[PDB]
Symmetry: D2
Subunit: 388 residues, 4 copies
């Protein structure tokens, strides 16, 4: 019947999302700034579970130690009054002109040292607020031209930075983990660790890999034309999906950050299906931008649509899996065999198995249809609620 979200659904929003003033490359802001406290109250009314923030969203850049203290106190009371949580925090290493060539991988060494200190300062605040995950989006790490950045040295600097933060966390005894958010491009011509895969590979080279995971975003992988649910499957397979950014994107172009459900709808369905069947227990975080055509009423409707869409898809995906006709179709397509080991009998046995080569009837096997189209139409019917 209806689709009301409750804090139990674990839906979270960055302050910078509903707070996006509408400034784009070709235009000025179309909305006034939101007081983070108003955003907390409004999201709470909508059924959200918590909020996330960059240091600079909560405490204006260059704020003194006193002003800083007041901003946090104000934010803290709003949280106490609403029951909202703060499961994730991050650093802004992309807005200020000093980070024009990056933070952790800036060619200027002094800039790199500054970026680390700025991050460390915010990690202490994040722990103070109860955040369990600390996200790192290296938006300025990259280049527009080939000779500007030696990638191998840049990767040495990136590893050095992450190892230092890991040494810091472990020395303060914090119970906080890191999640690297990949993005292929924008604002840099090409960004380092462009996809979930590159991020996962890099993590295996850190001194304490256990502390690092990935924070994939729907639109980012889609900006590279990749299959998001497949990338998420691989991150789960590796045990590295620490957090997730949900939104929508219409193909390969600029990062749109539409509300979740918009963009590639079928991909959204397969994503929810995967997260739910895999038992993902982390937050369902929306990193979206309510389009600039909207006024404040439009932003809250956009935020509500994020949660609504997730809930509808969850219903349809659940109905899909529980359908006996679908369970039969899955067996018809041999999904059950895919889950069985190819050779639990071992190498030697396989080599001696004449049924696996010498006596294998390749034409008989080749003639078997996979029945994938029937299966996919069942999935389509379920998504559209068209199952008679």
């Amino acid at each position: 019947m209806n689709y009301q979200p409750t804090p139990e659904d674990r839906f979270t929003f960055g302050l910078w999302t509903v707070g996006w003033q509408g400034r784009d490359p070709f235009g000025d802001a179309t909305r006034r700034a939101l007081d983070p406290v108003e955003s907390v109250r409004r999201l709470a009314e909508l059924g959200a579970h918590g909020v996330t923030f960059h240091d600079d969203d909560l405490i204006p850049f260059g704020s003194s130690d006193s002003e800083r203290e007041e901003h946090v106190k104000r934010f803290r009371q709003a949280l106490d009054d609403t029951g909202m949580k703060v499961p994730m925090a991050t650093t802004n290493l992309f807005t200020h002109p000093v980070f024009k060539d990056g933070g952790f991988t800036a060619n200027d060494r002094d800039v790199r040292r500054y970026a680390l200190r700025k991050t460390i300062r915010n990690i202490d605040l994040a722990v103070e607020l109860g955040a369990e995950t600390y996200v790192a989006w290296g938006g300025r790490e990259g280049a527009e031209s080939g000779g500007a950045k030696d990638v191998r040295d840049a990767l040495d600097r990136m590893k050095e930075a992450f190892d230092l933060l890991g040494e810091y966390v472990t020395s303060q005894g914090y119970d906080i983990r890191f999640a690297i958010e990949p993005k292929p491009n924008e604002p840099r011509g090409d960004i380092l660790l462009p996809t979930v895969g590159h991020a996962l590979a890099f993590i295996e080279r850190l001194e304490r890999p256990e502390l690092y995971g990935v924070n994939p975003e729907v639109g980012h992988e889609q900006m590279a034309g990749l299959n998001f649910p497949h990338g998420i499957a691989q991150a789960l397979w590796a045990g590295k999906l620490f957090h997730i950014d949900l939104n929508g994107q219409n193909g390969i172009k600029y990062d749109q950050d539409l509300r979740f459900g918009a963009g590639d709808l079928r991909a959204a369905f397969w994503l929810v299906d995967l997260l739910e069947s895999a038992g993902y227990s982390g937050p369902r975080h929306f990193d979206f931008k309510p389009p600039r055509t909207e006024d404040f009423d439009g932003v809250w409707a956009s935020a509500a649509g994020c949660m609504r869409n997730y809930l509808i898809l969850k219903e349809r995906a659940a109905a899909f899996r529980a359908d006996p006709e679908v369970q039969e179709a899955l067996r018809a397509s041999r999904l059950d065999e895919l889950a069985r080991p190819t050779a639990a009998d071992g190498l030697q046995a396989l080599l001696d198995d004449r049924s696996a080569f010498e006596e294998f009837d390749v034409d008989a096997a080749a003639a078997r249809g996979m029945a994938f189209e029937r299966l996919d139409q069942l999935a389509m019917d379920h998504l559209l609620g068209a199952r008679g």
Copy 2:
């Protein structure tokens, strides 16, 4: 003056490249098949170092043990007469209809067992011929629809397969290593391990990671809009660039496999620059298709252009790096600082360093230009041979 390749340049070609008959999705072959022996002699005349092959290129599918023996003997004499080497070999797990849903990750278990036996048989042949690398391109591993393939189970099957081959190699005492070739899509809607990053991450989950590397292809990463030289830098950083496939691609669309140099020319320049300065010593393998508009004279001209283009770029990249004006520009852009550790002084020292935050003048740092445009124009001048 001129650009003649010699076997010392380590240029290699797959038999399937100059041998591509021109069959495409919408058209029939425009060229007769080439006898692998003729291809060996022709490539040798052109200055190539060696050739590579899929089992099915050398020995027709379904060949008896006797015919098989004759085909190899014939091929062996051609190699002896020309001095050509065979540094890499691979398996064809994509053409025959039996592999329509994959080889190692086919839902059908019997198909998966067959794919392993077929690969093992060819590994023995590869070692016999002296190949040091065995490439694996899972072209049929993937899907067109969401419910057809459970990616986590598929990744379990992929790992199982690679671990078994690793157990085989180590048991026969072979001195051969594996290289996984990624591709984002085509012929499947989405292919598993779509980019160099995903492949590198997966490798870290194998039982014997030391035996596996990556075989990236210029056009494949470009089909995802990614920066190829950056991906190669990361593979080198990880010590996993075991082999490389060179060709050209005009952006995001079907896999064109144009001759090397064609497609994104500037990317080709930065690639050669990187491979040469990094001391890549493996083969410079061309996996290209001479367009179907060509007759045989056109195919040999296309193959020659591959090597010619590599040699010209190598000259221009060498001239770029050795230019004192460029060395000065590199210092102006702080590439030297990027190579210096951010905090060799350690964590505690960084936290106590007031020059890294408290007394850091952010406006002064922000005002410094990176001088990247001057550097890039110097690179452009060098590429075009326009340095006065």
Copy 3:
């Protein structure tokens, strides 16, 4: 409740669609060839309205005049027995090696003359069978390299060819019109008249523009990352949508030709909405390929899914428009004002209108939200059948 198609729905299929044997760039056929007569009977059973064909699908290439006559007679009886119609026909100017550099724009003049004769021969057959539209897809018209094709001369040849066919039709007194099908690339590196826009512009340069329209395909425009429904709106605006090819595509990559409904689902919804509200009365033609993983049962299920998906979307789009809440939302977003002339009062009046500039309150106007997000969520609810 259910979604059964009937010939009244005007659903048509090319013989080459359900008949696609599964041959792709990296693989052999996975299905035997279908007798066109069997395809006619099977599609009729499924509720289809008619079929379409290339000359070479019906009459094997190189067939004598007698064999040709028999093939047509056989096909004719199948049509008579089923009541199926043939509303569109086309020429195959892409498969045979002679068309490797094109048909109408081949550099070889003799080839260009041959292509015209081949098309003319099939136009006579099309009229004989009752086809009202003749489609032209210049799949081989284009290039892989810059100097191979002088585009201005190629466009002169393209216009010459179309003008000649127009002169032929008008001289035989045929009641048949032409529809040019655009495609950005594949099989050529870049194809001439790459999008609906380029095709529409070209048509305005023909001697008898009235005889030519466009035959857009969902996936083709999406291979250029364009909004298909927007392109269709422009073709309707110009009065040039003579026919349409329906299928699915997952973004920018090779031409997938998935069944309709698959690919970008939301785009499919907006397309059906537009065609139905605009009163498009031509055929709903599916130019799709049942994936090669399927056997014959899978191909017929895929074809049925094409029609089913169109019918479901038509229902949801109709429900969307007829919803009073949606009609109210449309007024809230000023869609009614968009339909009103900006200045029916004329130029002079506008220049003298102080309310249009001098006394225009720009801040007041800027503050009005467009309410687009609320509208889009209503559309999402309707698509998913989630309207309470």
Copy 4:
């Protein structure tokens, strides 16, 4: 030897190019604003021919009639002192929040009337300054969601607007023409008239088509993965290339606006080749953004690189065409035949010509290679200055 530009080369720059302060979606300005007068003097020193402007670049928005007059006088003296010309002008209908849903196609009628008045006011100024072309880039014309914009009505409003401007120009007796600049997306999710083709088609529906042309931009067509030189060939073929925007773009992603020469280098070569051989006599306008990593010295170096790159390519393209070996290769590939009419003998003659079908030897024709690869390698050698 060297490549110095002189005003005779007709190189022009928009004030907004070298003046771009570096503000992007994720960052603040990294450069102070430039006084348009300083930009005029600086560009003049670099060898530029003239500058272009949006109304809002020259006269701050909301300026009184007096301030307006002073700004123009100041700008006028700078032009007189340098000898710089102003060949093109345009309107800013994208920055101010009032244009959030468009200017000419905004759903709000009052906004549409305001946009026309604002444009008309600037047309008078453009003529006053001597501009021969008036560009219109409908950056805000489009949508993020399907129901927000009825495209057919939007196209009615777009035509109404352009017809009114045409009526205005013709009534004032101005000798100024319009050029529509297409762009597929950004800042809107999808922009109306997304490519050169769509723009050309639309123009044929205006009341006075003679007054309208197109202003294509390198990067814009490349954001749709299209071949820019091919699009330019079609615009020239139609006699509609009134102006051109030159820059660089690295594939399908956000609009980078790199300096000319950067991005797809080979495409830049083929573009210059075409413009020069076609005798394009309009300005060579650069619409680029010096990357934000740069300080002012870097912006002037970037602007100089634009002109330098154009001059180098012009040299290489000229050398390519004048090479007798290339002229021979062109004949070998039948470019001379492409330029010959297919059937100047007429329709009836073609139908009676047995050599065009009945007696046409298709196998003989099919066997002829096009020799395109040899031709393309000659072009590569010339571009790289590697012709021995």
